[PDB]
From Swiss-Prot, chains A, B:
PANTHER family: O-SUCCINYLBENZOATE SYNTHASE, O-SUCCINYLBENZOATE SYNTHASE-RELATED. Its cofactor is Mg(2+). Its EC number is 5.1.1.20. Keywords: Cell wall biogenesis/degradation, Isomerase, Magnesium, Metal-binding. This is L-Ala-D/L-Glu epimerase. Binds 1 Mg(2+) ion per subunit. Catalyzes the epimerization of L-Ala-D-Glu to L-Ala-L-Glu and has probably a role in the metabolism of the murein peptide, of which L-Ala-D-Glu is a component. Is also able to catalyze the reverse reaction and the epimerization of a broad range of other dipeptides; is most efficient with L-Ala-D/L-Phe, L-Ala-D/L-Tyr, and L-Ala-D/L-His. The keyword Metal-binding applies.
């Protein structure tokens, strides 16, 4: 039984300003969640709210701690489905929903003498994450790309979306100095339908292959996502357009995308599990991503990825871009590789 | 880790012959599955093969005991997702796939010190099953209906499909002497689309309400199921047409039915979990059914239902129709009520 739920503000600084389409961050403000059971067991989760994607604000999350306590204290974690249904009402605070739900499983796994990944199926023992190259000058982008490659990452995520011509130039240059690596391009909704297609064609013509082309158009433009998918040689993914299990069910029905970038910060554990099942029951493929989680937060996704083994690609580099005094995940990080203890 | 698997035939005789559209059974021949772990823990499951629904034959299941053994031994039950994936290759032996997957969770939960239902979410502490009135003369159907009503069952499942006129009469007669009960009518594919619609409209005209109208047409007639759904007042369910998670995705995409009768014997635990997620992500509603399971076999569905709490109706009565020496389920039953220990 849950006897207490604590929310705490935790600030983390980025090695350097992180720039993506329409956004620049030098700080990541998260809300840490701790659940305490009467037995003494403590489960931990982390919420990394996004105003841009989920409409959330950290101050708002912190303001509802008491309501969260009233919602689930007294409930036994072995009846976790009840906790999941209740926390699903927090659809306006998706990142907190995710933290609370994971902390619940974290606590439950401890009581059962096991780990969250095994509770979810323990399908994989290891997964590899890519690392992101934020928007900057072509020169700096190429520089960072080389450094990432030299660090051992064989999947490089390239941000674009604000300048088609320069974006194409950047991808081409990066490709030259990182032969052997796969590439993921993320426009974070910056392109129009035709621009998105032009980008893919231009890069394809140079002999460059893109593993995943993330959310090229605006979030409401489902038809646009489909248009790019059907007129672009690379796998197209929905990120901002895919927050709930209902959004995914809709994207599948419309045959809108080849991929969906699942993020616990958008869907929580409950919807994430539904999306995994939906993808495995259709032609949809998945990749798991992140927002601004610290190591404790990425831990939630690592266990989810390892347990379900449902992803072709993993973009869980958030903690790698933040200055963090001490590692706090229940997993092992070895370069791009991640395993469980 | 699993060090061995054993399959063995188990026969159960019916209190009386069970008659449904195009099939009469006097006995249920099941295949019990036992998995042994290096720790000494033993997991149990039961396969109730259906030749009519799954194309399975008891002899064939027993014949591949060695193959199954080779497939799963050496795998830790904490990595159950791996076992699920491997056993998914037994799509030609669905009932066996179910028995093995459940035996796995049964063994896993024992090691973790909990029960299968809690492992699956522990959503509910109690569920209620209906009881079936097989095909017979109107007079005998009415007699069995009264008896079932007297036993405390408030949801009565009525078999029909071989005689439209007599079927209507049977349902109308049963309704008069069981006021207060809800009814589920199952045609087992016996009607043409128009006959199915006429059956429903006639019952409706007499002021009778049908909770679930199961598989009124042939299994391949998806548009027929949809036709009945759009032209009759009661919720229409797919049973024989819904075996795999892929069948369900198709049924949802085509808006063919209101309900899907999930059966572990058709889907196994893996697909059943996917179907539950697909339903919760759409307008689809679910009921859980059975084939010819004995108490040990029904236990698999009871835990699935209690843990997921995903069903509106429960048709888990096969063990109540079979003569069984000793009860062998890990659950408690009081009339239509079923709870866990
Ligand atoms: Mg993205
Ligand atoms: Mg049926």
């Amino acid at each position: 039984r849950i006897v207490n739920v604590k929310l705490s503000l935790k600030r983390y600084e980025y090695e350097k300003p992180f720039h993506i389409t329409g956004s620049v961050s030098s700080e990541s403000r998260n809300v840490e969640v701790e659940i305490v059971l009467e037995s003494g067991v403590k489960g931990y989760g982390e919420a990394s709210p996004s105003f841009r994607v989920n409409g959330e604000r950290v101050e708002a999350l912190l303001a509802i701690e008491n309501a969260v306590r009233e919602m689930i204290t007294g409930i036994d974690v072995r009846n976790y489905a009840r906790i999941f249904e209740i926390t699903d009402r927090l659809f306006g605070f998706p990142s907190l929903k995710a933290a609370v739900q994971f902390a619940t499983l974290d606590a439950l796994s401890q009581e059962l003498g096991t780990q969250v990944c095994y509770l979810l199926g323990g399908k994989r023992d290891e997964i590899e994450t890519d690392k992101t190259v934020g928007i900057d000058t072509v020169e700096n982008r190429v520089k960072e790309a080389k450094k990432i490659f030299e660090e051992g990452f064989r999947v490089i995520k390239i941000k674009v979306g604000e300048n088609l011509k320069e974006d194409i130039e950047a991808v081409e240059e990066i490709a030259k100095v990182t032969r052997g690596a796969k590439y993921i391009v993320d426009a974070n909704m910056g392109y129009t339908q035709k621009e998105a297609v032009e980008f893919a064609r231009a890069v394809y013509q140079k002999g460059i292959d893109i593993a995943v082309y993330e959310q090229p158009v605006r979030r409401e433009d489902i038809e646009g996502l489909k248009f790019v998918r059907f007129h672009s040689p690379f796998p197209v993914a929905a990120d901002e357009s895919a927050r709930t299990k209902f959004d995914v069910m809709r994207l599948v029905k419309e045959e809108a995308v080849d991929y969906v970038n699942i993020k616990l910060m958008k869907s929580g554990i409950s919807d994430a599990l539904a999306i995994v099942e939906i993808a495995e029951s259709s032609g949809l493929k998945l990749m798991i991503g992140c927002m601004g989680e610290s190591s404790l937060g990425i831990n939630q996704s690592v266990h989810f990825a390892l347990g379900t083994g449902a992803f072709e690609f993993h973009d869980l580099d958030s903690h790698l871009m933040l200055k963090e005094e001490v590692f706090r995940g229940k997993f092992i990080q070895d370069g791009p590789r991640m395993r469980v203890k």
